[PDB]
From TrEMBL:
GO MF assignments: 4 iron, 4 sulfur cluster binding; catalytic activity; metal ion binding
UniProt keyword list: 4Fe-4S, Iron, Iron-sulfur, Metal-binding, S-adenosyl-L-methionine
Cited SUPFAM superfamilies: Radical SAM enzymes
UniProt xrefs under SMART domains: Elp3 (SM00729)
Residues binding S-adenosyl-L-methionine: Y34, G122, E124, K137, N185, R188
Domain Elp3/MiaA/NifB-like radical SAM core: 14-214
UniProt-recorded name of the protein: Radical SAM domain protein
Binding-site list for [4Fe-4S] cluster: C24, C29, C32
């Protein structure tokens, strides 16, 4: 079965859980097959999720919740249990993920949970045409500062056919200038038709080696590097 509970042991050490949610409200990104873990039956998702949530201890004071979609697609009972656990285990910082289409719901979530929330979002690349015409993310912003109104931490994807060195260089320039957290995901081939560019990945691995050790940004050479998921 799938690993759903682990610890992140570098940089901002924390517990992480990979939970089940109803279908991603977008669900059409050309490269994504994590949504295979979605399920329409929220009562079964809640039962599965509750066994994972029992493992949270708050031992680092920091927790990350991911769920192959956005936080808001979790069962209502899962969300309210996470809220309970935050208070009971004295957790002071929570990471969640939400697609940009949920931007306007973030403020109310922050006000409900009260603690520091780091909201991650799957920008993938700041290049508009690659993001929306190739990766089909449906993420539209006019200025970088618009993202920062509600999101804290862009997930970036590196190493996809159709990218260029210039495109990747600009993404890292933007990440490092504007954002206080972020995630660098080296692309992994999967069941979708979107494929790794091995030459770009080789180049990035050597040219941006100093990124691996940058305290602000999590770096995943393989998607399983947090210890959850297949
Ligand atoms: C649940 S999504 C992000 C949250 C939200 N649904 C969104 O898209 O904005 C998880 C992230 O994993 C990364 N990812 C997906 N497929 C990948 C792959 N094949 N290789 C590397 N990273 C991948 C992407 O950066 C994606 O944003
Ligand atoms: N279904 C499924 N969901 C996943 O999230 C996943 C992962 C790790 N994805 C994480 C890595 C960086 C992002 O923060 C986060 O989305 C590996 N295998 C998986 N399978
Ligand atoms: S990358 Fe995010 S928005 Fe796109 S299908 Fe996957 S979980 Fe849904």
């Amino acid at each position: 079965s799938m690993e759903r509970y682990s610890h992140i042991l570098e940089k901002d050490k924390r517990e992480i859980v990979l939970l089940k949610s109803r279908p991603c409200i977008w669900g059409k990104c050309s490269f994504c097959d994590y949504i295979e873990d979605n399920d329409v039956d929220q009562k079964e998702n809640q039962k599965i999720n509750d066994e994972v949530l029992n493992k949270i201890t708050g031992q680092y004071g920091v927790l990350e919740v991911i769920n192959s979609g956005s936080f808001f697609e979790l069962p209502d009972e899962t969300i309210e249990r996470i809220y309970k656990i935050i208070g009971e285990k004295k957790i002071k910082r929570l990471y969640i993920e939400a697609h940009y289409l949920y931007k306007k719901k973030i403020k109310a979530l922050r006000e409900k949970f009260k603690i520091e929330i780091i909201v991650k979002t799957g920008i993938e690349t700041f290049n508009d045409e690659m993001r929306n015409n190739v990766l089909n993310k449906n993420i539209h912003f006019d200025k970088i500062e618009e993202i920062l109104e509600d999101f804290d931490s862009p997930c970036l994807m590196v190493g996809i056919q159709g990218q260029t060195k210039e495109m990747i260089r600009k993404d890292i320039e933007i990440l490092t200038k504007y954002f206080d957290h972020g995630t660098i995901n080296i692309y992994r081939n999967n069941s979708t038709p979107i494929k790794r560019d091995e030459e770009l990945i080789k180049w990035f691995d050597e040219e941006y080696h100093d990124l691996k050790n940058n305290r602000k940004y999590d770096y995943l050479g393989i998607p399983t590097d947090f210890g959850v998921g297949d």
